[PDB]
Every structure is written in structure tokens, then in C-alpha cells.
Amino acid sequence: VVGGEDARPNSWPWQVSLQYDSSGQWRHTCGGTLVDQSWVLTAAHCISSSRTYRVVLGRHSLSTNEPGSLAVKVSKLVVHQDWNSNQLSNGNDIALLKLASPVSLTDKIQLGCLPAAGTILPNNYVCYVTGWGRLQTNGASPDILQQGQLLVVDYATCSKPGWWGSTVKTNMICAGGDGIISSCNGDSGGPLNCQGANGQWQVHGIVSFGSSLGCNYYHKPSVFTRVSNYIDWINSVIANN
Numbered sequence: 001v002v003g004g005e006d007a008r009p010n011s012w013p014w015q016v017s018l019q020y021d022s023s024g025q026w027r028h029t030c031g032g033t034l035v036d037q038s039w040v041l042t043a044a045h046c047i048s049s050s051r052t053y054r055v056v057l058g059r060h061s062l063s064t065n066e067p068g069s070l071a072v073k074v075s076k077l078v079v080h081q082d083w084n085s086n087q088l089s090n091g092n093d094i095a096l097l098k099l100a101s102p103v104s105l106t107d108k109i110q111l112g113c114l115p116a117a118g119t120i121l122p123n124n125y126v127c128y129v130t131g132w133g134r135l136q137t138n139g140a141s142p143d144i145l146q147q148g149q150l151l152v153v154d155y156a157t158c159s160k161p162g163w164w165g166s167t168v169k170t171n172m173i174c175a176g177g178d179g180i181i182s183s184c185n186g187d188s189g190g191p192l193n194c195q196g197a198n199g200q201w202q203v204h205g206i207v208s209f210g211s212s213l214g215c216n217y218y219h220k221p222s223v224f225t226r227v228s229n230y231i232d233w234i235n236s237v238i239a240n241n
């Protein structure tokens, strides 16, 4: 996250680290959200069928084995069937990962709540992106979970040709776009968290893409997969695997 700050420890208890095996080291590559005791939600672009995956849960520092943090092997990968890696701007950038065994819920490890089907956030809605990605474009990755505040930019604005133009579809969410705060490489797959009308935190987006001009860029909002578009698919995959 560029332009953000350290999260409070364990305050985003659904946030996952998605890691792969790199030459006998476990290496962070994407974020994710725990969405059921057996399933993590993430971005399809984070998945290669050739890598091997584990998920780390209940974490704050990526390098410290903190008490009550947990690594679990990932055993099944389910990418959205309409995802095309060669057409990232079509959307459908979504994947569900099955854990080898269910996690027990705790104070540090909780489920992230999804919005109703079809829910659209209005312009300037307040949300927060979280992750262990880069702190600036091509710069450092933190050890500690960051968060950053991002306001929703609605479709009508974000599709303008000064913004993303036609890169952006109604199956995505735009947030940010001031050039101060953004997601960045390494935040991919993790949550856009927005608090619903009754206090509750919900995960509305999955970090998908930013601009080749830079992670933080005026009138290039960070783009997210819109979770309220796949509620039905998420539940089918879970019932059927």
C-alpha cells in the first residue's frame, strides 16, 4: 500500500498472506480473505497451477511467527471459469482456494463478511485497502500489515476517458485516484474493506490492477474485482468442492 499506515495488530482478522514455495523459501506473493473455515478468496491472477501454495493467517508481521498465527497448506485451486489472463481488463479476476484442513476461529483469525448480491457502493464511499504490498511503486515491501484509506470512485466517473476509460467494467470497483493512496504490487488478491450501514466490516473488492504509470496515480484509481458480483459463484464452489 502506498501512502498508508501500519494497521493495528490483528484488526483485520480475515486478511491472509498467500505464499508460494520459492526454492525452499516461503515467499509472499498475494493477499487474500478468509471467507469460510476452509476457503480463501483471492485474485485469479495470483494463481499459477505450477506453484505450490500455503496461506498464512492471524498474522501482523510477515517475518515473525507470532503466537496464534497459522500456516495452512492449500489443496485445491478454483479460478473463475471466465477469467482470461491475457485480458485482465475484462474482469472476472477471482479465485477460491481450499485449505488442507479447516481453521479454527479465534480472536486473530476470523471470517470476512461478504456484501449482499448486487450491492453497489456510491461515489466517495469510505473504504480501506489492506496488505503487505509495496510502499511505493517499485519500492519497498513492509513487514507489518499496512492499511490505507481509499474512497470509492463510481462507474460513471471511473469510466471517463480521463480516468480508466473503457478499461473498466461494471464487474469492477474503482477506489482512490487522488495519487496519494493506492494499492500496489503484492496487495493483489487482498480486501477492499468497507463498513456497511450497520457498523459491520465487509469485503467488497479484491485487489486486481493499477496503472502502468504507477501504483499511486492521479485519476488512476486502484481497481478491484467487485465481490457482490460473484456471491452466487462463491457459494457454488463451496457447495461443490
Ligand SMILES: *C(=O)[C@H](CC=C)[C@H]1CCC[C@@H]1O
Pocket (backbone or CB within 6 Å): 045, 046, 133, 183, 184, 185, 186, 187, 188, 189, 207, 208, 209, 210, 215, 222
Ligand atoms: C498486485 O499486487 C498487483 C496489482 C496491485 C495494484 C498485480 C499487478 C501485476 C502483478 C501483481 O500481481
